[PDB]
Design a protein around this nucleic acid. Structure first.
Lengths: 137, 137
DNA sequence: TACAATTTAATTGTATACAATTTAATTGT
DNA sequence: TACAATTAAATTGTATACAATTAAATTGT
C-alpha cells in the first residue's frame, strides 16, 4: 500500500497541517516557514543565521532567500556579526515583534483541529521528538 | 509559544529528516522521494490518471504535471490523453519504469531499520499519524 | 607562528508545493 | 439545441528544500 509507510504519513500529514495554517498565516501575511523563524525570533530578538538553521533543521540554502524576503517585508533586519565577520545576525524590527500579538490565536486554533483526532497528541509529539533525534544522529 | 513544542513543526522537521534518509537509497535509482511515491502507486497499478495520483498523493497538477514530465523524460512512464474523457490524462509504466521496481526492494527495510529507534511501536506512531491525517483532511 | 584544514554564508542548479488563472472538454435538467 | 457551470490539466508566479561549490573569515598547530 502507501498509507502504511511511516515516511509517507509524516509527509502527507505535514503538508495538510500546513494547509490548515494558510488562512491564519495569510492574516499576518507570512508563510509557514517564515512563521517558524518568527517563533524563534519572538523568544530571542536576535539570532545568528547558523542558530536559526540549527533549530529549524534547514540551511543557508533555504534561509538566505527566505530571510531576504522577510527583510524586504520589514519583519527583520540583518547584519554581519562583528565578533565573527563570518556569521550573520538576524534581528526583529518593531513590526516583527508586534506581529506576535496577532498570532496568539494560532496554537489553540490548530489544536481545535488536530486534537479533534482522539488520542493524546502529547504522546505523538513525544514520539516525534525521539524519531527526530534518531533520524538526526 | 516555543517552536519545539508545535506538532506542526515536528511533522515538518521529522518528514524532511526522513526524506534525507531516503536520499542515499533513491539516488542509486536516479529518482526523488516524491517520484518514488508515484512509482509505488504505479508498481501496484499499471495505469492511473493524473487525478487519481493527485488524490492518493495529496497533490495537484502543479506539483504533478512538472514531476510526471521529468519522469517521462527519465523513461519511467508514458502519458497519453484519456479516450473516456479527453480532459484527463493517463500515466502508464514503461518497461524501464517497471523493471525499476526490483531495485527498490530493500529500501523499506533499510528505512524501518534506521528508524525503529522510537519510544514505542511504529504501529502506534503510524496509527497516530494516520488519524491526524484523516482529521486534517 | 605562518597557513593549511575548517567554518559560515552566499551562490548554483534541480526539484518540489501550491494558489490563481487558463484552456479545453464534458455535464445538469 | 442549448449552454452556464463544472471539471481536469497546464500554466504562471511565488516560496521553499537541499546538494555541491564558492568565498571569505577563524582556528589549530
Amino acid at each position: 500500500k502507501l498509507e502504511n509507510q511511516l515516511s509517507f504519513l509524516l509527509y502527507a500529514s505535514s503538508r495538510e497541517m500546513t494547509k490548515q495554517y494558510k488562512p491564519l498565516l495569510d492574516k499576518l501575511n507570512i508563510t509557514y516557514p517564515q512563521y517558524l523563524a518568527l517563533l524563534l525570533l519572538w523568544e530571542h530578538e536576535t539570532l545568528t543565521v547558523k542558530k536559526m538553521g540549527e533549530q529549524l533543521y534547514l540551511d543557508s540554502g533555504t534561509l538566505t532567500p527566505m530571510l531576504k524576503r522577510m527583510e524586504q517585508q520589514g519583519l527583520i533586519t540583518r547584519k554581519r556579526s562583528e565578533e565573527d565577520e563570518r556569521s550573520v545576525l538576524i534581528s526583529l524590527t518593531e513590526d516583527g515583534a508586534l506581529l506576535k500579538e496577532k498570532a496568539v490565536d494560532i496554537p489553540g486554533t490548530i489544536l481545535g483541529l488536530s486534537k479533534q483526532s482522539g488520542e493524546d497528541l502529547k504522546q505523538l509529539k513525544s514520539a516525534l521528538y525521539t524519531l527526530l533525534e534518531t533520524l538526526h544522529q
